[PDB]
Amino acid sequence: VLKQNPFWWTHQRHDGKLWNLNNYRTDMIQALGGVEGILEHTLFKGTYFPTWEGLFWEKASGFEESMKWKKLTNAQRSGLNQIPNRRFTLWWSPTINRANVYVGFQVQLDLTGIFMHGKIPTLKISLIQIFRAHLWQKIHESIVMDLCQVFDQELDALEIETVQKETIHPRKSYKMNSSCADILLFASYKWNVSRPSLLADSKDVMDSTTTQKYWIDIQLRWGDYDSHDIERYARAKFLDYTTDNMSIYPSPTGVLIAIDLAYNLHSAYGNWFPGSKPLIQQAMAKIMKANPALYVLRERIRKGLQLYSSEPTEPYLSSQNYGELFSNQIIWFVDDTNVYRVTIHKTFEGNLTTKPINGAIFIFNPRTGQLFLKIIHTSVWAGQKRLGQLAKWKTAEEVAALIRSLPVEEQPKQIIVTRKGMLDPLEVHLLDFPNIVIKGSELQLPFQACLKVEKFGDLILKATEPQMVLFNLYDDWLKTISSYTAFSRLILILRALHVN
Amino acid sequence: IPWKVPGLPTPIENMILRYVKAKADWWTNTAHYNRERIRRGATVDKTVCKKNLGRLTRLYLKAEQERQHNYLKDGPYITAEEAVAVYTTTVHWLESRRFSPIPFPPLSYKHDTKLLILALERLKEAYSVKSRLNQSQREELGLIEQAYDNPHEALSRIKRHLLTQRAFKEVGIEFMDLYSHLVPVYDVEPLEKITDAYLDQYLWYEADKRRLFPPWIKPADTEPPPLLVYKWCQGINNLQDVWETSEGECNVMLESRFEKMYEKIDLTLLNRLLRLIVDHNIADYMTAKNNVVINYKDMNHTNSYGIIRGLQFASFIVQYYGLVMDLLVLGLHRASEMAGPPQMPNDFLSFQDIATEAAHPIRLFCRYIDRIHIFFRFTADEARDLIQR
Amino acid sequence: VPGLGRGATGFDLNDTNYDEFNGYAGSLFSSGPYEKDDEEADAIYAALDKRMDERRKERREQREKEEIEKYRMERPKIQQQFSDLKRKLAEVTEEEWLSIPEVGDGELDMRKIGQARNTLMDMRLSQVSDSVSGQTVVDPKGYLTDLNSMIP
Amino acid sequence: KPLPAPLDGQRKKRGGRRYRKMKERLGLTEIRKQANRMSFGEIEEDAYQE
Amino acid sequence: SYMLPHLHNGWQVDQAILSEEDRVVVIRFGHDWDPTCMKMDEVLYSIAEKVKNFAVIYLVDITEVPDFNKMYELYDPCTVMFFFRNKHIMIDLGTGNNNKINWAMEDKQEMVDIIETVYRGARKGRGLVVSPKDYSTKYRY
Amino acid sequence: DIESSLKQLAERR
RNA sequence: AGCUUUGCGCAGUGGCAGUAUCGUAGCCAAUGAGGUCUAUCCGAGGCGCGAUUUGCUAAUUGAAAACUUCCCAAUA
RNA sequence: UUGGAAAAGAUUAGCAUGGCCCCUGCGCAAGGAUGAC
């Protein structure tokens, strides 16, 4: 073989594992500062992922297949192979974009606060794509508008006369050299200008200074590994803006806020107005929780870094949620476990009759008292040159196609599947139609009793053609008894049929 | 490949030949200089390395073709008398060991399925999951899957190929880009490779059962190479008075290798010797497989004097050649004493008795793959006699 | 016509004409502005330079000529290389120089002695191999014939 | 030995029993799960299993 | 050799740039005397019959037609520049500028890939085609 | 054709 | 007079679709390409190229994912 | 009805068309079988 194998001494499957370096991995993780310390230099904080154990990284799965299932040229292949390098650079960008890591070459991203102290083409491209479609200015404007709305929601009680945003240039939301005032809200009274201190401080100190107009400002920053100290940097920025040569704020008692977009943090160390510091804190907390532009930016950053948290799955229907499936949301209790219908009959001598039987699938809606049976001919399941996984995929595709045949207005809002492993193929087959939630139903209902019916069972045995004929599962309870009562009666009837 | 342009003017042909000779000389000098620089550790690139590797591979192929042509012209290097003496010594050694020959695989071998599965697994492990596979690679994988599907039919086809296919196809030849010691990479035909792997697994199992390979043949599964070195070190001191130089005794451990052992393997002698151990039909099949047309790019040459290392049967062939060479070097009495009695053979680097350890200057000897190492504790009188001789 | 017609713009100061030693090539004084007085001044300057360069000129020239003659033994020009062939190559006639096709379309028997030696060695070995005790042989005829004795 | 022109497909409009058969047999859908996740919190395999 | 016909006249070269529009036009401004331009011509001959169906490469001599070396300022011994339908495409080599290659590319595959990427970028209209190579370094080790 | 250009280039080198 | 054979072309239906459908332009080929049965028997395909083309609809991402003006203000 | 400022169209999936294999109705060749006081 033309490949040099360094393990020329012995084989792992012949002599055994001669080393165990897992302890080395644990020691390297701990000695770097633990998981939290390692991620601190990374951009995990900006992703707003509060689960350091649940998040899953898409290994070579950021795109569809990075165009691997294609016949592109060599240049496209090289670009695809170099794409993971950009993601790796972006992941460890804060530890590498620090001005103390490279030489002083401070360059600010156009129309953005990203001050890339250096020239890393991969990380530069990743940052530019992350802030695509003029995201920085829009995010700043959205933050300002959200703060203004939050203030004006209960500004009357907080002694506010009139709140209006000043005429701030678009280039005044990204240029750190020259600042301005974001909110210009009047107070209708001699608002005692409290001493300019950090909002994180709990000290109530107010110097003998009063005025009428109080200003509030907001700044956007992308802090590095060392520039993540939002409180101190914000205090220094406010102090410099107080005596700024060109940042001519109208109110000298004008507080300023900062957003650590890179590290997902916010702070404000300006003149906290009497009774407004808790209001500013609550507004900032609510924004950082659910800021629209910030949420969009965090989603884009998560997508760019090939990181996507494992979304919660649909819960199982226990004995308490048994009756929850009768609501207006249409639920089709899909249970096609008995689709493997064949006749293994011991012939008199020589062999046994290996004649497959015509199978079927079960689709019933207790939420509406419906029953639709799709029969699977034995010819489709015999001689197809495939394993059982292909048959299961075909069954899931048939279920999805039957759902698509049903109108969208009649699409089942929930799809309870008895088969445990059939949920993933069901979601994959009809990912284009995600209005149906594949909820788990651990307690399997005896829906197989239809296959033992005098009419339904005989039809299923002889239904050599795929028929989507409907039926009434409830004998008369659809228009006579309650829907939950109808489901209970159907369950009792099926249990009696299965009993003996 | 000869350049024949009979429709061209004679002066034009002469000029073309002169230009070709000049370019060949320049290319040879450039390739030698680049190989020297690479061996020394000069700064090169991927394009330069690829070009130098290609030129070196072409030069090595041409040199091997010339060497094979000269071997055919000069005939067998080994004389008839020396070959007969070597065969007699090997026959005597085998008779003393009473090694029952490994017969052809019976129609109902107990472990035939296990050996076939092991060979198929060992051949499949080479095909790691890559971006894609070549058409020949795809055909090889398909044949492996088919063999894993019908083991009985695959074994029948392997037996038919072994008993009949005495003229195989062309085996490819590529050179691993090792900076210091370039090594070849020979790829056999897929069905031929499967047959060779089955034959090699069967021969190794039969040799292990019959104890064909001797203990001093070092590379084995029992002792890894570092453990082999540790065991040699431990057993060196275990000899009686292995350090007492007070009486003038001196111990000399000679570390040597058989230069060109793989290259200088007489195919006819290999056929004549392996038939004494392996099945006559199987030995003839292996000898025929040893002779193939090495194909690489536009260059194709035959092989008559060197065993191909790419073939899966090389391990057994190289082991038998090394055993013959060791029996020649160690001697009949010394090898017999080192291998103990046939009924109760001695372990590695161990003598049947303390007296049998000091019965000759040769005390410890480990015949690695193309690398010998003999520890000799020559007495003062013995050392003086050897120096005088 | 200039290159402006193509509508192209940017993105003897050539680098080849330039160098570290002596800067760029060429003469800073244009060869145009000459005259008869220029001829006289140039003649006087050249005569002075030649006079001041004749100290070791004879010995240096002789040594350099000898060195060039010596180097001619180991330094053949590419042209010189094919010079002998190119001289004779002109002898090809017009028919010979037109029939050149497109490139798209007693004695010593060395192997005889080798074959004889191999046959002798094989015969000697077989004579030695005829003395073997229990060398086994599985007949391919029987094995192939009995191969299909357990086939489905 | 010509070189194919640097041209690609125009647009996609067909799918299902016309182009889905090729994308299901030749470019068959793989697992697409349990082989692309990394579980950045835990470590499933050994430290140097590779 | 130099099978690629060098456009002797500057105006002839300009018309040749205006001649073909559906393919890639590459002009080798290197002087044929220097060995570096000889290596560039050899690399072009390697891709002479390959990129022919997608490109039309012409040689040039800065001594013959000086206007190209005085207006475009091609001072390198052998600089490879591109012009597509009266638009000099820029290859993002990363060497500070993108007007020329300026390197004796001895790899035929690299030149072929660069030509293909330049053609793709010209089809996409990008005046600065991102070169799929790390030309900013020597790419040797 | 190319012969003249090749000869011109060769004569200068 | 009614039907029907090779069936043809039209239109509908059923199914198949990477091994396949076809051009195959490169080549052999009704003047035999191929062999364990059949060998004094059989008689028309095979090697290599390339795709499986015509449109509509939903969704999907994006600020905009397109078909002849637009954001605004007291009224009519 | 009245009144002021003004990606060089992409990704993903099904449906039919489309390709061939079967039949049918149509149109008709050369025929095949029959009724003709």
Side-chain angles (χ1 to χ4, degrees), chain A residues 6 16 24 31 33-34 37 46 50 54 60 62 75 79 84 94 99 104 113 118 121 133 157 170 181 187 196 200 223 234 236 250 252 254 258 262 268 270 274-275 278 283 285 290 292-293 304 312 315 323 350 356 359-360 366 369 382-383 388 391 396 400-401 407 412 421 425 434 440 446 449 457 463 466 486 496, chain B residues 2 6-7 9 11 22 24 31 41-42 54 63 75-76 80 83 85 101 103 105-106 119 126 142 147 151 154 167 172 184 190 197 207 214-216 219-220 224-226 235 248 258 283 288 296 306 310 314 322 331 335 339-342 345 348 355 358-359 361 365 368 380 383, chain C residues 2-3 5 7-8 10 23 25-26 32-33 41 43 46-47 76 90 101 104 106 114 116 134 140 142 152, chain D residues 2 4-6 9 15-16 27 35 41 47, chain E residues 5 10 16 29-31 35 48 55 58 66 77 82 84 94 96 104 121-122 125 127 132, chain F residues 10:
Chain A
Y24 187 95
Chain B
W216 56 79
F258 305 142
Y296 161 53
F348 175 78
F365 163 53
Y368 207 74
Chain E
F29 295 122
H31 191 273
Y58 290 73
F82 304 105
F84 177 93

